[PDB]
Write a protein that binds this ligand. Structure first.
Ligand SMILES: Nc1ncnc2c1ncn2[C@@H]1O[C@H](COP(=O)(O)O)[C@@H](O)[C@H]1O
Ligand SMILES: [Mg+2]
Ligand SMILES: [Mg+2]
Ligand SMILES: [Mg+2]
Ligand SMILES: [Mg+2]
Ligand SMILES: [Mg+2]
Ligand SMILES: [O-]
Length: 137
């Protein structure tokens, strides 16, 4: 299995939870939170943080990462199984997202909209789980 990781970044805007999604610049132009392959020497944690910095220009210092809220998605990518481990992370301040060549747009999305845009059933279930976690947090 090809291993990847990322961070489900959220913010609270005027009391409302919103999740950050990024639109790939390459077809199928799907939307996911910042995430990427585990690179040599890294574990999932390191990869999730680095990919977040690379893809959205959000640093570890700008985030409160909830270590007790993580989930791993499994799906076929490039004819092979791929795992993507995500941790939930709060963007504390009104920092500005900036993209790299890997993405062409972004959106801050309320739960239902995020699920619709992310489109994949398993990602949807993950977002619901993470939303439920914040409700009890
Ligand atoms: N949660 C998912 N379930 C199934 N397929 C996905 C999921 N996320 C991304 N993909 C697809 O897998 C391929 C690799 O996407 P990615 O893992 O985002 O680089 C793309 O063609 C996506 O459409
Ligand atoms: Mg990468
Ligand atoms: Mg990526
Ligand atoms: Mg990347
Ligand atoms: Mg890359
Ligand atoms: Mg709103
Ligand atoms: O990447």
């Amino acid at each position: 299995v090809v291993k990847a990781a990322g961070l489900v970044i959220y913010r609270k805007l005027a009391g409302k939870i919103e999740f950050l999604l990024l639109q790939a610049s390459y077809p199928p132009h799907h939307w996911t939170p910042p995430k990427g392959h585990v690179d040599p020497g890294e574990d999932e944690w390191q990869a999730a943080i680095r990919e977040t910095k690379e893809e959205a220009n959000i640093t570890k210092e700008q985030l409160t990462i909830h270590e007790d809220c993580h989930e791993t998605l499994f799906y076929e990518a490039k004819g092979k199984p791929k795992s993507v481990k995500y941790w939930l992370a709060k963007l504390n301040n009104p920092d500005d997202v900036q993209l790299s060549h890997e993405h062409q747009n972004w959106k801050w999305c309320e739960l239902e909209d995020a699920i619709k845009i992310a489109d994949y059933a398993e990602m949807g279930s993950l977002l619901r789980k993470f939303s439920a976690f914040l409700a009890g947090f």
